[PDB]
Each structure stands twice: as structure tokens, then as C-alpha cells.
Paper text:
Others, such as [name]-1-encoded bNAbs, preferentially bind group 1 subtypes and then increase in breadth to group 2 subtypes, similar to the [name]-1 clonotype B described here (Joyce et al., 2016; Kallewaard et al., 2016). Members of clonotype A preferentially bound group 2 HA, whereas members of clonotype B primarily recognized group 1 HA. In agreement with the binding profiles of isolated clones from each clonotype, the early intermediate of clonotype A primarily recognized group 2 HA, whereas the early intermediate of clonotype B was specific to group 1 HA. As expected given their HA group preferences, clonotype B was more prevalent after group 1 H5N1 vaccination, and clonotype A dominated after group 2 H7N9 immunization.
We describe two genetically similar [name]-1 bnAb clonotypes from the same individual that exhibit different developmental paths toward broad neutralization activity. HA is a trimeric glycoprotein that is critical for viral entry and is composed of a globular head domain atop a more elongated stem domain. The HA head domain contains the receptor-binding site that engages sialoside receptors on host cells and is highly diverse among subtypes, whereas the stem domain carries the machinery for virus-host membrane fusion and is relatively conserved. Two HA stem-directed bnAb clonotypes, A and B, were elicited upon vaccination with H5N1 and H7N9 from a single donor (Andrews et al., 2017). Both clonotypes were encoded by germline genes [name]-1, DH3-3, and Vκ3-20 with the same CDR H3 and CDR L3 lengths.
Residue numbers in the entry:
A (entry chain L): 1 to 30, 30A, 31 to 95, 95A, 96 to 213
B (entry chain H): 1 to 31, 31A, 31B, 32 to 52, 52A, 52B, 53 to 82, 82A, ...
Write the structure that this text describes.
Amino acid sequence: EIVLTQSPGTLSLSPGDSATLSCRASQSVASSYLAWYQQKPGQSPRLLIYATINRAADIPDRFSGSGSGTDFALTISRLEPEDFAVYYCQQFDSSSMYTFGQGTKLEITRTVAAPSVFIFPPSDEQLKSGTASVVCLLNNFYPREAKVQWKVDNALQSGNSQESVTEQDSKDSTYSLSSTLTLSKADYEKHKLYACEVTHQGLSSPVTKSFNRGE
Amino acid sequence: QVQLQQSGPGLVKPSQTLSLTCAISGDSVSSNSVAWNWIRQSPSRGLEWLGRTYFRSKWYTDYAESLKSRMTINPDTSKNEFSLHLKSVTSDDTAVYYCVRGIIFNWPLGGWSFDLWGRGTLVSVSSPSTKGPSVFPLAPSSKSTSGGTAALGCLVKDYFPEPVTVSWNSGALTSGVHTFPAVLQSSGLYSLSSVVTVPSSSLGTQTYICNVNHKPSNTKVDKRVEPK
């Protein structure tokens, strides 16, 4: 019944900046019952602020809560890379017992970093089972935008690869990416040259890593 | 201090009942100054409070209005635990489930805050049976004098459902590890890679093992990754 609307949905700021995260309630919230949580990747939420303004034990002074009524805010002064997280507001009332806002994702901007690229042939163990996975790794880059192109004997591949990307590293704020090209064993043994070509803002020209089957 | 140990199946079939337990150490399930909650999280629905139980000279329970018919929370004082039972589950109940301590600091003037959260249990509401992964090495290749850094890893392929956990050298190798999100293949099985960068000079002397654990299938694999 009480809806909490957080804004902005995503915010990207540099270390040393200040962030203001807003939480707007659909009706008045008693100030003792408004809390804020921080959730870092792979972790459970952590209490940051309770009763609108009160820092939880051992939370740094850079985190501060404010507001009243319908409008609340979490301010983070002097951003650090480790503050990369999703921040949630939360309230309680007799009619709608506990509700959360949808979260604001605080991303960290850093200077451009080109990826380091590696290619991995399929293992002999896997070939024994009739399928071949070729993996291309893009390590520690920024920003997140990156294009990976697979070529087999210089023929561009389409439709036969999948990729996934890590969240920003809490220390150096980079991403890493893995792309897997999946072929049948028969198709894999029918070709020789396997190549991963990478395009990224931090590369003046694309980088290609390759190998020849049986070498 | 306080530990909240969660347990229960990671896979539940549609229409069946999803049960989880939270075993408390360092606090009392019947303490009259806290309350014991279940909260879940999904990418679509966000964080959703499900219910709570607490003792004030008798037991009380409160459930989210949308779930009041489908849910039950039961405390157990002899084992100092409390459990969640969610009936008639559908894929909308696929989520990470947390057990969570609620407290009112500076009561009676304060208000509720969720000050301790368990690690959380991913529950997938799906019909297929569990399947353990095959684990293949991602070998460092021709990277013995290629700048001093070698990348190696493990490909964790064809398992169901999520999650798998990957460590390196039984947790002794943590810096430089990236374990990527799984992707769902057209087969309906997941595939994931975990990589680490290491000094090229160490490849001859240092052993590197990825430890893969797939709890839903009781599968554990230790795979040594060696250079080509």
C-alpha cells in the first residue's frame, strides 16, 4: 500500500564525488520507520541507515540520511570504488507491513582501460564427448562496451556463441568478459584457425588472439 | 556474535511446497526484543518481505497480504530455528530467500530495521531433474614468458539448476579470480567459466586446482589445471 519510488535508477560517478539517492513514498512515512540498505555484488543486503538519519554501527560518516514525510535521501560523500552497490530504501506501516524501494545502482566511473585478451582451445577431455567449447577472455577493462567476433578459418561466426560479464570490481572498477564458441566435434576438427577479435574504446585498433587446432 | 545458518532444497517442482530453515546461533528465536523474518529477492520483483515470527509471552506471526493464504512460518525453540513453508509455488517464487533479524533500536521510540541477514538460498521452481556439471580445464597456452602473466581456468558445463560455487586451491587463491555468471544453453543446462591470472614463472612449480561444488546434485569436482 505504501510504495517507495527510488531515483535515479542508475547513477555513475567518479571516486571523490558525492551521490544523492532519492526515495519518494506514496504517502507519509513515520521517520522512525525509514531505513536504507547497501547490497554489494554476491552479498546479502547490509543495514546502512535506520530511523531516517541514524547510521548503523560502524558505518562510515560519509553515509548520511535525511528527509521526512514523503521525501527521503541517502547522501554518500567522497565516493570510493568499494561503494559500488545497489542501495535500497525500506519502510514499515500497519497497513502494508514492510516494503522496499526498487533500488538505485551506483556505478563507478574510472579512466578507460583496454582489455587483456586470452583464447583457450577445447580440452582433449571435452572433445572425447563430441562437443568443443572455445573460450575467449577479456580481462579487466572499462567501460563495459566491448565487441567480440569469432572467426573460424577467417569465416565470421554467427549464432553459435554466448557471453557473460562480471559486475564492476569493487577495487579497480573494471569488468571482465567471457565468450564461449560452441561447435560439434566434427565441425571443430574440420577447421584449423580459431580466432577471437576484440573491439573496445581502449584499443586503437582491434586485438585478435588465435590458435591452430593441433599446435 | 550471531550466525544465521540457512538450509533447504535449491530446486522445487511447480505446485509443490518450498520449505527452508534458518538455524540461529548467538541469539534466541524466542527473544522478546527481536523478530525473525523471511525476505526474498528476484531481478523482476526486487526485495520482498514475506513474513515474520516473534515471541512476546506467546508466539505471533505476520505474513505479507499477498501470501497470507500460501505461507506459514514455524519457530522451533528446542533447535533455536525457524522455518518457511510456501505452498503451491510457481516460477514467480524463484528467488534468493534470506532469513533476517528485525530489531527496534532505542525502543519504544525507534522503528524496525533489518540488521542481520543470512547468506541467502537460491530456490529455482522448475520441473527438470538435477544434473551435475562436467568440469574441463582452460589451460594456459604458450604463456610461460608472455609478459609474466598466465590466464587459466575451468569450464563448468551442463549442470542444472543453479548455482555452482567455484574456489581455487581450496580457497587459498582468491586474488585475480573472476567467476562469470552462468549462461543457459539451448539444452536447458547451464554453463559457467571461472578464470584466474597467475605468474607465468609459477606454472612449473605451483599447482592450480579449481574446486567446483554443485549442491543440488551433491556433485563436487576438483580439477587440476596444468599448462599445455
